[PDB]
Amino acid sequence: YSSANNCTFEYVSQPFLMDLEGKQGNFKNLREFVFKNIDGYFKIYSKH
Amino acid sequence: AWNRKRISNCVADYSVLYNSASFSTFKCYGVSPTKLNDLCFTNVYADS
């Protein structure tokens, strides 16, 4: 991004950790997300 | 050249406004300043 002017919400979620390998292989894991917006409030869901 | 600010996604209060503050004039229009607690606003600005 270039910059930001006027941010009405900011945010950091819960801590967690990631592997960050530089190798090659089959996808050992899976990630799912359902982004949605209902009645003016954003929401997200997930599973590993 | 007053300063316009944004109060968003937090909880305000009134009881922390006068205990030793002793300001010049505290008043509110269309609602008693005493019951700021029960009332529930949206997208509060701050100009000073």
Add this chain to the structure above:
Amino acid sequence: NYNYLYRLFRKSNLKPFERDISTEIYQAGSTPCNGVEGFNCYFPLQSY
């Protein structure tokens, strides 16, 4: 015409077909005014 008074303030609301005549300076919580009319002291009577 300054003979017409309307109540500036009251502790609570009124009742169907109710009248109040007596008068005290509005006082909030502690530090009772006793006619001082300083911070947190306000005059109940109002003039047109």
